[PDB]
Amino acid sequence: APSRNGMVLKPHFHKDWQRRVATWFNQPARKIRRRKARQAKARRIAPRPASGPIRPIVRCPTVRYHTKVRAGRGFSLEELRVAGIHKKVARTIGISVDPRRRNKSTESLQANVQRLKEYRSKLILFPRKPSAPKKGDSSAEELKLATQLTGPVMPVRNVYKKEKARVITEEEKNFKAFASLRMARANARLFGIRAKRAKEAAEQ
Amino acid sequence: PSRLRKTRKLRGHVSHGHGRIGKHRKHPGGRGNAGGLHHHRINFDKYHPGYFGKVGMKHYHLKRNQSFCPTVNLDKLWTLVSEQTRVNAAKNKTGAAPIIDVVRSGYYKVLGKGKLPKQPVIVKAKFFSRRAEEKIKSVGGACVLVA
Amino acid sequence: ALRYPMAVGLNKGHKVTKNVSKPRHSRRRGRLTKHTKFVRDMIREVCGFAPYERRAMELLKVSKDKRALKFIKKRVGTHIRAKRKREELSNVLAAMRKAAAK
RNA sequence: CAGUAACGGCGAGUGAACAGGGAAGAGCCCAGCGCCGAAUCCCCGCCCCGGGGGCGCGGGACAUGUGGCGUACGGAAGACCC
RNA sequence: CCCGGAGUCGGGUUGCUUGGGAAUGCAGCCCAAAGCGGGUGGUAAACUCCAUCUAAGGCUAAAUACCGGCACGAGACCGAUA
RNA sequence: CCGUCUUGAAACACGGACCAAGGAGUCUAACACGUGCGCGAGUCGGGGGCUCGCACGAAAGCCGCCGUGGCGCAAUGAAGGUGAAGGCCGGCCGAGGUGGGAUCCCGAGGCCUCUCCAGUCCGCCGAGGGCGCACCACCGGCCCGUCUCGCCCGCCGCGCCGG
RNA sequence: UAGCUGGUUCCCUCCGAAGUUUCCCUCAGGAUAGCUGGCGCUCUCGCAGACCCGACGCCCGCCACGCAGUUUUAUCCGGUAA
RNA sequence: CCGGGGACAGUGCCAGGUGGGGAGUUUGACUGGGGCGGUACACCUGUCAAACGGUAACGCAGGUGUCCUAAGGCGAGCUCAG
Ligand SMILES: [Mg+2]
Ligand SMILES: [Mg+2]
Ligand SMILES: [Mg+2]
Ligand SMILES: [Mg+2]
Ligand SMILES: [Mg+2]
Ligand SMILES: [Mg+2]
Ligand SMILES: [Mg+2]
Ligand SMILES: [Mg+2]
Ligand SMILES: [Mg+2]
Ligand SMILES: [Mg+2]
Ligand SMILES: [Mg+2]
Ligand SMILES: [Mg+2]
Ligand SMILES: [Mg+2]
Ligand SMILES: [Mg+2]
Ligand SMILES: [Mg+2]
Ligand SMILES: [Mg+2]
Ligand SMILES: [Mg+2]
Ligand SMILES: [Mg+2]
Ligand SMILES: [Mg+2]
Ligand SMILES: [Mg+2]
Ligand SMILES: [Mg+2]
Ligand SMILES: [Mg+2]
Ligand SMILES: [Mg+2]
Ligand SMILES: [Mg+2]
Ligand SMILES: [Mg+2]
Ligand SMILES: [Mg+2]
Ligand SMILES: [Mg+2]
Ligand SMILES: [Mg+2]
Ligand SMILES: [Mg+2]
Ligand SMILES: [Mg+2]
């Protein structure tokens, strides 16, 4: 019974719940078990950078999150073509192709080509036969810097460029900002119906 | 702690705080929110008016991302920048107004509650109130729209 | 200035420069090839027509084409599958009328 | 996200997803279309290593389609450059 | 030059199912396809732009579950009517 | 003659031969208010990650705007949507006014010393007067929904447009 | 499952009821307002001048507000008893 | 195989009828015990009701689920039962 004042509660416990209860008492056990498999994998791949391949810069996909930017699944084939590396050598180098990602814009295309070229100058490629370097790297380069990289490979920046102060010109000072939103919200609302009234009045 | 509860004080008294006449029974009055129109009607009408019935239009698959618009009032607008931004703009001989992009601070609409300190500023937002964009022009500043 | 890039209205959004590309090759699924056109009309001249198609062509001989549209729509199900079934069958009758005039 | 959109004698009650953040992270293969003298596989017998390898005018499967190349991120064949 | 999975999709109707609401999925039965086509674009319909993916073939580690089993370790637990 | 239900039990109401031992408001979730603590327009790692080799330690510490996210800082409308500054004279000020209002401030006047005369330096009482906290009642003001009346203004689009 | 029986385990201290209103397929029950307790909070009188000691300002006169199962003084109201 | 039926029967799916053979459920309340009768179950007047208001019984005497383009609204002129 409701007593005097309070919320109308609707608790979801009519469905034999205490047979299905997931306790979490193995939680510090599995933080140890996962961590011992990070440390074990990172010494299997001994100079390879402990975290997997490089990931692209990906813009987040809605109106709530499109100002921030994250790392994606992989590089698109159009980014691989104009950075000039084959789509089947790139996983052997640690690049992670994503074959189903489109490139609609140009400056997000260029920001990942610039990421790929800057990676390719940065990685150190050991030869197949260490007794005979074919095309990979100089043996001096493989000695004093052959360490494993921890954390993500060149993690994704949220760069906010600082615009400096300036002088408000007179016409920018005279800009009807609220009125231009209400007219733009009204023109798109009435666009189809004014075009219909225009084409029927072409005859009558 | 179980040593501070009424059960330890009620450990000699027969009814255990629930009365000899009435009793403590299982569910006298229904279970849950039973009876909100029939015998618990006065409790729902006194305290939760509006609980029974439909009002308004249904909208399937509400995606709350596409109606995201966090607002900042006009009086907490200089807190989005550092204090040497506001102070050096006041000392400036040439009329240079600093820029306040509210979108990198996580706001989309500027609302006009408050009062601005008397110095020009350029505010870049996605949306403005009517009287929020005329408390910027009266202080001598400018509104700029960003998509 | 004037015409700030605006988040509402007809011309809205962040004003980006689109690149043009060769489209994804999966976009041409079901485009008709020369060779599979040749297979698909060898089959028709050797199998004929279904009895609803053969009946719908009879309603199209007598210029009763609203009823033939309703009949095809009753048997294949959709209005847009029916009105391209009909103009397919009308191209059969337009071809057979022309081939029998000579 | 969320006891939310929504369901519901719209009563009691029920009730997810996408975005965001993490753990982990890996991609591929045919048929078909085609070209390659069926270029393919199983079995048996003999011969050399502890299944490999090599023989058999040895059987059989298989053109009612085995193998290679090749699959939507295109692919192939030609020239040309490397 | 070469390019793709049909009693399948899809439509109707019946039944169960789902948050899925003029029908979310699944099934029966009848109808039953197309190839610039087809599917999806959460209100039934016609019209038209646009976006998106390529169904009706197949394989796949890791992160995940574990009151049974083998073998261990521990506990602000019980102490022989527990 | 005790427990019990009852208007009413010593009862010809029920239960109880006697003894030992066991024996009944718990735990989880969600709320509400009250209280304690920490931080405070913010707050919180809860999930994950990092740290001599895991007695204790399955603990403890750390991260950084990993703050993603929750709640809070803005409401109202079914929805499109819109969305909280005045006061004093263009200039100054920055949430209005009346009534009460703990406290604090001023204070005429008094208050003593062996004795007056002049003066000085602090203390005590104090009529009246002022600024008035929180909270209360009232009156105005602002935002959104909706009515009734009404006249102006705006322009890249002169509109079944915007304000 | 039970709106129905039965039982519900230590001591002292303080406070201390209700069987009535309204609604309910309500009459062996609940919601509702009364009645109770707890937690406070906002104020008032003020504490009283070390032992002392009615006092110390302006001939008189005066000693805060509010409040009440009460009377007084005004003044309305009523149709019982007779 | 020989006869006999035969595109009917039959089966599958939908639709209409029938269907206590079978299933599930319900079968008000108040009440001088219950049932029967009544409705004191939503309303209205007079009384009870104890001269403010409030006040109970299956207390008394009655009414009600309608009627009305005037039987509503103004104005004027009239005066009724006997
Ligand atoms: Mg990882
Ligand atoms: Mg109690
Ligand atoms: Mg009891
Ligand atoms: Mg009780
Ligand atoms: Mg009782
Ligand atoms: Mg919440
Ligand atoms: Mg369910
Ligand atoms: Mg083949
Ligand atoms: Mg269901
Ligand atoms: Mg729609
Ligand atoms: Mg599988
Ligand atoms: Mg024993
Ligand atoms: Mg024993
Ligand atoms: Mg035992
Ligand atoms: Mg013993
Ligand atoms: Mg009795
Ligand atoms: Mg007794
Ligand atoms: Mg007796
Ligand atoms: Mg008894
Ligand atoms: Mg006995
Ligand atoms: Mg015992
Ligand atoms: Mg609290
Ligand atoms: Mg009962
Ligand atoms: Mg009883
Ligand atoms: Mg009377
Ligand atoms: Mg009398
Ligand atoms: Mg029956
Ligand atoms: Mg009865
Ligand atoms: Mg009286
Ligand atoms: Mg008259």
Single-letter amino acid, residue B90:
A
For tokens 């990172």, what's the residue? A42
Q: What is the Å distance from ligand 20's center to A138 Cα?
A: 106
- Would the Cβ of A17 be found within 7 angstroms of any atom in strand F? no
Single-letter amino acid, residue B130:
R
Resolution of the solved structure (Å): 2.8
Q: How was this structure determined?
A: cryo-EM
Cβ-contact B135, B119 below 8 angstroms: no
3 state SS for A71-140: ECCCECHHHHHHHCCCCCCHHHHCCCECCCCCCCECHHHHHHHHHHHHHHCCCCCCCCCCCCCCCCCCCC
Cβ contact (<8 Å) for B146 and C12? no
- Would the Cβ of A4 be found within 7 angstroms of any atom in strand G? yes
Chain C adjacent subunits, 3+ CB pairs under 8 A:
A, B
Single-letter amino acid, residue A76:
S
User: Which nucleotide has its C1' atom closest to residue A35's CA?
Assistant: F49
Structure tokens at B60: 């399937």
C9 touches chain B (CB under 8 A): no
CA dist., res. B82 & res. B85, Å (int): 5
Q: What residues 113-132 of chain B have any CB closer than 8 A to a CB of chain C?
A: 126-127
In the three-class reduction of DSSP (H, G, I as helix; E, B as strand; rest coil), residue A35 is classed as helix
With the C-alpha atoms ordered A112, A115, A121, A122, is the resulting torsion angle positive or negative?
A: negative
Q: What are phi and psi of C44, to 5 degrees?
A: -75, -40
With the C-alpha atoms ordered B77, B81, B83, B87, is the resulting torsion angle positive or negative?
A: negative
